[PDB]
Design a protein around this ligand. Structure first.
Ligand code: HEA
Ligand code: HEA
Ligand SMILES: CCCCCCCCCCCCCCCC(=O)OC[C@H](COP(=O)(O)OCCN)OC(=O)CCCCCCCCCCCCCCC
Ligand SMILES: CCCCCCCCCCCCCCCC(=O)OC[C@H](COP(=O)(O)OCCN)OC(=O)CCCCCCCCCCCCCCC
Ligand SMILES: CCCCCCCCCCCCCCCC(=O)OC[C@H](COP(=O)(O)OCCN)OC(=O)CCCCCCCCCCCCCCC
Ligand SMILES: CCCCCCCCCCCCCCCC(=O)OC[C@H](COP(=O)(O)OCCN)OC(=O)CCCCCCCCCCCCCCC
Ligand SMILES: CCCCCCCCCCCCCCCC(=O)OC[C@H](COP(=O)(O)OCCN)OC(=O)CCCCCCCCCCCCCCC
Ligand SMILES: CCCCCCCCCCCCCCCC(=O)OC[C@H](COP(=O)(O)OCCN)OC(=O)CCCCCCCCCCCCCCC
Ligand SMILES: CCCCCCCCCCCCCCCC(=O)OC[C@H](COP(=O)(O)OCCN)OC(=O)CCCCCCCCCCCCCCC
Ligand code: CUA
Ligand SMILES: [Ca+2]
Ligand SMILES: [Cu+2]
Ligand SMILES: [Mg+2]
Lengths: 51, 269, 45, 99, 102, 534, 59, 236, 75
């Protein structure tokens, strides 16, 4: 398929024309990744009665 | 041809594949298969219906992928000479990877057999294990594989030689001999004394020859699809690459069955 | 011919300060745990 | 005489004979070139393993040529090993009694 | 290259004589100062005349800046400036230190 | 939007999906290492209320995420799939649906690894999942099965991509490019793909053997039944040392590009670098039992393995001396990829010298399963491969994104990670030489002194990672303005000393590969007509 | 029965996606999406019981 | 004999094996420091004299007369560091005429020791399990995560042979100041030797991931003179 | 010194000594059928297997020889 060229069309995510700020998507993409081991820690500590 | 008309083609011999859903569909099928078997192995799912559904979805998605490959190769004319060379090289790297899987399994057999344990009795095959004798049915299984290669060789060279009936019949004989081998392996597995739980001997034996069994049932499947495509005139006299990969596959399953034969049935008894 | 100042002088006056700079950079790059041990209580000071 | 002396080199000569038959039949199948290299490989290999399976049933033929020499092995030199492991315990017991 | 120094000078004299524009004289000057030798006075003279033919003045200043960076001493630089003085004053190019005095 | 990214069939899109997954999983693994290192900061239970199983599960997740979900899909998956077709002049890879499924089987390995963490207790077994600990007696439940399936899906991806790479650079090279005239990064991905193709089968065999042992009552490594776990150690480490050379060889290619373009002179003896990489890849299959020096081998076994582990210091030494020779006599332009490459050239050699300390089995009885080994491999991993990965990002990001990064922030980020990584991983040699064992959540109180300074350095490293996240945000938002103001380096090569500022303007890029000649962000159809080379 | 030219003339002169161009593609493709849609979301429903520790009923 | 805070070197040796391991390590570290000084000096001087170099010598590519030298010179330094390593490797393996055997069996999170020579007047085999003293029952002055309730007592100036195995998973019998590190796998029996040269007490730990009690699994060896060993063995 | 131990044996002079204790066990228990009681050098085998083979294995193998599940030849 012929796809669009340009500067922002090579990324799966939207940066420029958005109704929400981009830093929402950007930093919530990485805070979820930083927060998977904390969800892991929480459920394996609630399973072991420490909470 | 003129510049104006040469400009309406690709300028390079390589297949620019159209976007297709089957990569992500097979990926989700492998996900469902993994998540279903890891929960039915431990009882969090009642029956095997989820694993059966997942394997069925995996198989049908692979079939739709292969259907699109057949459509590209036959009905759109997208497989040039460079693409053929690339497909043959990719299949050769694939069969090298599978020969290396079998080399790992042969390493497992040899590490158990070169100097065995004390819990089997410094013995190979272990005490109480009634080993499969190499003379009765596995000799017939070597014979119907060395003959299946001889059938598929003349089927191939008669496909090149212009003959139609002499190639279809040779392919049919090859396919039926492969399913003769698979039913004989099923008969051996039923009338075998030891099981896969009977120690490390049953482990390594059934691992090696059962991986070969699975490769042979996929070989019977691809011999069947080659018969279908040869009867329905998809395969041609100069452009038959899936047939060629199946011939390579037969002739490597032959030699690894021979190594399985002389190791698992002659040296290891 | 060998016009000008000698090459031992020309390259000694270039290589001499960089030896000392390399010594300083190497000792701060390797002996930086000595600066933690010196202020740790295990030295009893 | 020679028979067991290279019948315990039994599965080390037949794989060498397989390699000899494939890599020897390779030049006879490659001296007349019009086929592609893959067809030459599969036909040379098809001849070569007919040779190794025929030589392997000659292998079992030799296997019962050869042990009418001495009957009932797989134990009659576990006899050897256990017999002298036994009286090498004897050689130690004595001069620790008298040493 | 198993080149002697004399083959270098005779190669680069006729290499500077065959440059025909500003890209070529700057290119040839670059890849003659990119060797492990200060060029001889004759090829520096040929470089000056070549920059005269293309009519670019800062390249004939950058020639002397380059050999200042290229020689080992400042007395080798002053030896170049002695018997390259006649061609430099004939062409009328200034050295960079006397043009931009610090 | 669904056909470009879900149904994808061009390599340059699959590469950025690989890169997004890689940096997501690297945030996950860095969080796991922060939890590990925060628990290890002082003796006694600190943050996880006892619960050493959770510590072990986090160590497993940290190792598996950082190896199989950051470094491999970053280096091979992103940079190879992006750059090897562009540097051999291929329009795309051969077999592109294979190239798409080799990405999309990685989120599925990720979700099964995360639910491996969430089921009964997680698989706390090390990343080398040794039986009988990894069996069904010592690990009851679906944790280890799901971890094994994560390894299966990652091995499927890295085998299919390896086949794809081998065929697409043996078959789709452009019309002047013989094999001797390849770039060094293409040779890196080539040799890496052969190591993958030759080594991933034995790993898949070993962990399928383990899975059948766990669930199907078979006995490959069950002692009461005839097994041997040393067979698992052999079958694992026959993959495990080729795996760590797979991790480093594209780093060698990235460094050989960066060092040459920021020294402004070509690599000293390029074909000997290709020979050295091929010798490392060949000799990496002959050294696997240097991880098994303690298990009880013979003396001649260990003598051969010290010899073979020692003689791989020769081609790596050839590569590193060639890097010093190709920066000698140059015109160094100290940009951020050059800073990362010089830091590679120092810290990788320190890790390799501790590696040749470990190569002696005579001496490895003093260092096995200690934090000395942890120091060696975290040097050559988080300062070899991570530094070459950062170098590749800062080297290719403005070209293949179209957006420049803040240069001062990039150098701040470099100096923070170079300080912080040294502060983590340099005292680990002191701990390991004094006898501190591996994989312990708690230690004797005499090991507190270097553990505290290591976990202080951990915060410097993750602070520089957070700075890198902000650098990505500033590149994606203000990347068109960074070209206009003087916040970024626009040209990675300055003019030569006699090259005018106007004669530089007709020849702005002077590269020996196609990647920097393309249009910024490169076209969806690059190479309509094929590129040509003498 | 040698329909290959007649099928070439359909597959090349078509607008639909390649897995839809055959006339019999609605018979394969519509059941497969339902079977696939249940096959990928039914283990995801059992994921919470596997987290909690609730085994299925067998006796 | 015990780790010290902020240490950076080996523990103090007690066997000839460990005192040879220390000398081989220092001999390797000698040439390693030579090579490190070379490459760090080059890496300093190159980026400090060619960062300010505006003309790059872009025609230096081959260097034939010195590529052979930096291929050959690493090989001879490998040979020099490999000469004593082989001697130590073939010295530490021989277990020749030992005066004592001791079996050490790693169970999950205790060690089980077994003197099996019947040199006693009781004539029976001596076994005991040595558990970590837990943190709440440590009486004052005891070393946390190192002290045990029972101890392994060994005479000095005696060739001892440690036969090491396990029961369920892979453990590691490791004492660094004695310089023994030996994997306890549940299928086989390994052996190491030692000759303790000085009396004292030497600590070690399980250096193989056993599970959730892996940190709580220490080794404690009291080496005494042979009278005191005999009077210890007369009870247990 | 009253201290005496198994010496090294030329059949097994390497690090692994599993087939030292197993071989001396099977050699001891295949004494006393062919050899019998009160035979003076089958305590050589006895000291060799009980000095270096662990108690779990000894009682497992003695249980197995009372089973008929012992994988040696001592009958
Ligand atoms: C890829 C390899 C890799 C990397 C990078 C790391 C990085 C770190 N690791 Fe570790 N580690 C291992 C591989 C790695 N590790 C392995 C294999 C084990 C063995 C497990 C076992 O014993 O079974 C281990 C175990 C291990 C231990 C030993 C603990 C034990 O034995 O149980 C410790 C000690 O604290 C540790 C801590 C850290 C810390 C603080 C970092 C920090 O350095 C993190 C800082 C690093 C960064 C901030 C990198 C930048 C982040 C990115 C995401 C790059 C993004 C850039 C682009 C995408 C262009 N990890
Ligand atoms: C990035 C991947 C990577 C790389 C490149 C290396 C490189 C090397 N490694 Fe390492 N290693 C690992 C990843 C890596 N390693 C991992 C992940 C583990 C632990 C696994 C686990 O247990 O979980 C490990 C552990 C490990 C062990 C196992 C020890 C143990 O577990 O007890 C050994 C043993 O020999 C070893 C040695 C080496 C050697 C000799 C090199 C050499 O290739 C290094 C060569 C480089 C140099 C030698 C320096 C440069 C050369 C010169 C300057 C020339 C002059 C120098 C000389 C002549 C010496 N390392
Ligand atoms: C993927 C890449 C890695 C591959 C690693 C090796 C794969 C091994 C293939 C297993 C086939 C074993 C087999 O077919 O064994 C046959 C056995 C049953 O036979 P039996 O013992 O009841 O018959 C003897 C009766 N007298 O089936 C099993 O119980 C296991 C089935 C699941 C295997 C998966
Ligand atoms: C699972 C079942 C595996 C059965 C595979 C059958 C392949 C059918 C598609 C086909 O045969 O594709 C036909 C094409 C080429 O067609 P052609 O040029 O011969 O057409 C001629 C028109 N004139 O071959 C290929 O692309 C290579 C096929 C390799 C497939 C390997 C699959 C291995 C899966 C392992 C898991
Ligand atoms: C390479 C050089 C590394 C710099 C070491 C700085 C020491 C900081 C300090 O100060 O360490 C403090 C320790 C503890 O002091 P103490 O217990 O002697 O205190 C009693 C009196 N106050 O000193 C030492 O024991 C050793 C000091 C010298 C260390 C040289 C040997 C280093 C080991 C080499 C192997 C490790 C490197 C692995 C390869 C990278
Ligand atoms: C290079 C940059 C390195 C930064 C990390 C340093 C960690 C310092 C530390 O960890 O400080 C720990 C020590 C000893 O503390 P303690 O053991 O007495 O107390 C343990 C309970 N807190 O305190 C100091 O030495 C303070 C002085 C720091 C000097 C650093 C000099 C570096 C050059
Ligand atoms: C392991 C999985 C099997 C890999 C087979 C590789 C064959 C090499 C080759 O020749 O691949 C050619 C085709 C892919 O061709 P394509 O559509 O990418 O090429 C476009 C040119 N026509 O193979 C396949 O259909 C592989 C199908 C794999 C199905 C998933 C199995 C997962 C397990
Ligand atoms: C509190 C945290 C640190 C704050 C830094 C203050 C900078 C002061 C200032 O305001 O600095 C002004 C400068 C001007 O920028 P300039 O370089 O364009 O101008 C150069 C003028 N010559 O901004 C900066 O360079 C720094 C901006 C970076 C700030 C980092 C943001 C936080 C990163 C971590 C959080 C994101 C990740 C978390 C998600 C997982
Ligand atoms: C013991 C070895 C340790 C090596 C340590 C590695 C150091 C790496 C960093 C320094 C590398 C130097 C640059 C590469 C050499 C080079 O530039 O080679 C290019 C030129 C060859 O070109 P030519 O024909 O003009 O010269 C003709 C002369 N053969 O040779 C040189 O000019 C240097 C020659 C060095 C001679 C041996 C010195 C050994 C001391
Ligand atoms: Cu026992 Cu770790
Ligand atoms: Ca702690
Ligand atoms: Cu390794
Ligand atoms: Mg270990």
């Amino acid at each position: 398929v012929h796809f669009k060229d340009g500067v922002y069309e090579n990324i799966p995510f939207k940066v420029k024309g958005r109704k929400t700020p981009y830093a929402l998507s950007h930093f919530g993409f990485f805070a979820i990744g930083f927060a998977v081991p904390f969800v892991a820690c929480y459920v394996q500590l609630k399973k072991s009665g420490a909470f | 041809m003129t510049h104006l008309e040469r400009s309406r083609h690709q300028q390079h011999p390589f297949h620019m594949v159209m976007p297709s859903p089957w990569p992500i569909v097979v990926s989700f099928a492998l996900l469902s298969l993994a998540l279903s078997t890891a929960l039915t192995m431990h009882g969090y799912i009642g029956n095997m219906n989820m694993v059966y559904l997942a394997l069925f979805v995996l198989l049908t998605s692979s079939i739709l992928w292969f259907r699109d490959i057949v459509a590209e190769a036959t009905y759109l004319g997208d497989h040039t000479m460079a693409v053929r060379k690339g497909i043959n090289l990719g299949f050769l790297m694939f069969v090298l990877s599978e020969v290396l899987i079998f080399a790992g399994l042969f390493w497992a057999y040899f590490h158990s057999a070169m100097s065995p344990d004390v819990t089997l009795g410094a013995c190979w095959p272990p005490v109480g294990i009634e080993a499969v004798q190499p003379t009765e049915l596995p000799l017939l299984n070597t014979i119907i594989l060395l003959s299946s290669g001889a059938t598929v060789t003349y089927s191939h060279h008669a496909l090149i030689a212009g003959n139609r009936n002499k190639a279809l019949s040779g392919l049919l004989i090859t396919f039926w001999l492969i399913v003769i081998f698979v039913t004989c392996q099923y008969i051996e597995y039923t009338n075998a004394a030891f099981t896969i739980s009977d120690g490390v001997y049953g482990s390594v034996f059934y691992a090696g020859t059962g991986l070969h069994f699975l490769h042979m049932v996929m070989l019977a499947a691809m011999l069947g699809v080659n018969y279908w495509r040869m009867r329905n005139y998809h395969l041609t006299a100069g452009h038959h690459v899936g047939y060629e990969t199946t011939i390579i596959y037969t002739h490597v399953l032959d030699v690894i069955w021979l190594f399985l034969y002389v190791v698992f049935y002659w040296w290891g008894v | 011919g060998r016009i000008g100042e000698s090459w031992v002088i020309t390259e000694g006056r270039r290589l001499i300060p960089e030896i000392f700079q390399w010594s300083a950079v190497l000792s701060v790059c390797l002996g930086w745990p000595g600066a933690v041990y010196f202020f740790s209580k295990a030295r009893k000071a | 005489k020679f028979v067991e002396g290279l019948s315990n080199n039994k599965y080390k000569i037949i794989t060498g004979a397989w390699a000899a038959s494939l890599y020897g039949s390779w030049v006879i199948v490659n001296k007349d070139p019009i086929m592609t290299k893959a067809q030459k490989i599969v036909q040379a290999r098809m001849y070569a393993q007919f040779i190794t399976v025929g030589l392997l049933l000659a292998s079992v033929g030799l296997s019962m040529y050869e042990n009418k020499l001495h009957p009932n092995k797989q134990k009659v030199n576990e006899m050897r090993r256990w017999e002298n492991a036994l009286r090498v315990a004897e050689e130690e017991e004595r001069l620790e009694k008298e040493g | 290259d198993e080149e002697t120094f004399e083959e270098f000078t005779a190669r680069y004299e006729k290499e500077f004589d065959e440059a025909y524009d500003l890209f070529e004289v700057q290119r040839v000057l670059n890849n003659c100062f990119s060797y492990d030798l200060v060029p001889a006075p004759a090829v520096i003279e040929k470089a000056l005349r070549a920059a005269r033919r293309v009519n670019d003045l800062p390249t004939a200043i950058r020639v002397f800046e380059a050999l200042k960076y290229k020689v080992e001493n400042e007395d080798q630089y002053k030896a170049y400036l002695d018997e390259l003085k006649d061609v430099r004053q004939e062409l009328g190019v200034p050295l960079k230190e006397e043009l931009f005095p610090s | 939007m669904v056909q470009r990214w879900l149904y994808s069939t061009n390599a340059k899109d699959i590469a950025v999906l690989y890169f997004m997954l890689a940096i997501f999983s690297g945030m996950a693994g860095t969080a796991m290492s922060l939890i590990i290192r925060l628990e290890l900061a002082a003796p006694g239970s600190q943050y996880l209320h006892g619960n050493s199983q959770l510590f072990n599960v986090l160590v497993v997740g940290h190792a598996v995420l950082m190896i199989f979900f950051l470094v491999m899909p970053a280096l091979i998956g992103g940079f190879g799939n992006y750059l090897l077709p562009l540097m051999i002049g291929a329009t795309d890879t051969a077999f592109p649906r294979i190239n798409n499924i080799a990405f999309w089987v990685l989120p599925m390995g990720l979700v099964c690894l995360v639910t491996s963490t969430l089921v009964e207790s997680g698989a706390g077994t090390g990343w080398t999942v040794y039986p009988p600990l990894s069996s069904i007696q010592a690990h009851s439940g679906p944790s280890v099965d799901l971890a094994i399936f994560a390894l299966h899906l990652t091995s499927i991806s890295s085998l299919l991509g390896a086949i794809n790479f081998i065929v697409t650079t043996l078959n789709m090279r452009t019309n002047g490019m013989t094999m001797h005239k390849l770039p060094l990064f293409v040779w890196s991905i080539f040799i890496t793909a052969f190591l993958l193709l030759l080594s991933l089968p034995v790993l898949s065999a070993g962990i399928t053997m383990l899975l059948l042992d766990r669930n199907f009552n078979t006995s490959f490594f069950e002692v009461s039944g005839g097994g041997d776990p040393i067979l698992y150690e052999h079958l694992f480490w026959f993959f495990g040392h080729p795996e760590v050379y797979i991790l480093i060889i594209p780093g060698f290619g990235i460094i050989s590009h960066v060092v040459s373009t920021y020294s402004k002179k070509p690599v000293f003896g390029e074909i000997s670098m290709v020979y050295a990489m091929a010798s490392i890849g060949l000799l990496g299959f002959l050294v696997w039992s240097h991880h098994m020096y303690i298990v009880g081998l013979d003396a001649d076994t260990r003598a051969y393995f010290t010899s073979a582990t020692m003689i791989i210091a020769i081609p790596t030494g050839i590569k590193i001396f060639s890097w010093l020779a190709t920066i000698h006599g140059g015109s160094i332009r100290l940009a951020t990829p050059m800073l990362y490459a010089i830091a590679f050239l120092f810290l990788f050699t320190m890790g390799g010298l501790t590696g040749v300390a470990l190569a002696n089995a005579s001496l490895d009885v003093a260092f096995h399963d200690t934090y000395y080994v942890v120091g060696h491999f975290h040097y050559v991993l988080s300062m070899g491969a991570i530094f070459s990965l950062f170098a590749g990002y800062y080297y290719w990001s403005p070209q293949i994104l179209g957006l420049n990064y803040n240069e001062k922030l990039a150098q701040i980020q470099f100096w923070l990670i170079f300080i912080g990584a040294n502060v983590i991983f340099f005292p680990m040699h002191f701990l390991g030489i004094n006898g501190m064992p591996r994989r312990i959540p708690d230690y004797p109180d005499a090991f507190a002194g270097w553990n505290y300074v290591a976990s202080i350095g951990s915060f410097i490293a993750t602070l520089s990672l957070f700075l890198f996240i902000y650098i990505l945000y500033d590149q994606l938002v203000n990347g068109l303005n960074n070209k206009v103001n003087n916040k970024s380096v626009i040209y990675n090569k300055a003019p030569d000393f006699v090259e005018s500022n106007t004669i530089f303007n007709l020849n702005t890029v002077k590269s020996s590969s196609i990647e920097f000649l393309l249009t910024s962000p490169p076209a969806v159809h690059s190479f309509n007509t094929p590129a040509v080379q003498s | 029965a040698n329909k290959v030219i007649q099928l070439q003339k359909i597959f090349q002169s078509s607008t639909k996606p390649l897995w839809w161009r055959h006339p019999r593609s609605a018979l394969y493709l519509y059941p497969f999406y339902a079977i696939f849609a249940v096959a990928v979301v039914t283990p995801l429903l059992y994921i919470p019981n596997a987290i909690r520790g609730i085994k299925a009923k067998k006796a | 004999d015990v780790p010290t805070p902020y240490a950076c070197y080996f523990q103090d040796s007690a066997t000839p094996n460990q005192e040879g391991i220390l000398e081989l390590h220092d001999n390797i570290m000698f040439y390693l420091l030579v090579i490190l000084g070379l490459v760090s000096w080059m890496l300093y001087t190159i980026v400090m004299t060619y960062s300010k170099n505006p003309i790059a010598y872009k025609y230096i590519k081959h260097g034939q007369t010195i590529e052979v030298i930096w291929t050959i010179f690493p090989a001879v330094i490998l040979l020099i560091i490999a000469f004593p390593s082989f001697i130590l490797l073939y010295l530490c393996d021989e277990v020749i005429s030992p005066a004592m055997t001791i079996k050490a069996i790693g169970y999950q999170w205790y060690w089980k020791y077994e003197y099996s020579d019947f040199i006693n007047d009781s004539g029976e085999t001596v076994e005991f399990e040595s558990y970590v003293i837990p943190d709440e029952l440590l009486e004052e002055g005891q070393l946390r995560l190192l002290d045990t309730d029972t101890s392994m007592v060994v005479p000095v100036d005696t060739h001892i042979r440690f036969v090491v195995t396990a029961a369920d998973v892979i453990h590691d019998f490791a004492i660094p100041s004695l310089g023994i590190k030996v994997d306890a796998t549940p299928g086989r029996l390994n052996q190491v030797s030692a000759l303790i040269q000085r009396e004292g007490v030497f600590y070690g730990a399980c250096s193989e991931l056993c599970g959730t009690g892996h940190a709580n699994m220490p080794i404690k060896i009291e080496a005494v003179s042979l009278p005191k060993f005999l009077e210890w063995l007369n009870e247990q | 010194s009253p201290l005496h131990t198994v010496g090294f044996d030329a059949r097994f002079p390497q690090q692994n000594q599993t087939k030292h204790c197993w071989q001396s066990y099977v050699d001891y228990h295949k004494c006393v059928n062919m050899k019998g009681e009160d035979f003076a050098p089958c305590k050589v085998f006895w000291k060799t297997y009980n000095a270096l083979c662990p108690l779990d294995w000894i009682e497992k193998w003695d249980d197995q020889r009372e089973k008929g599940i012992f994988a040696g030849d001592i009958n």
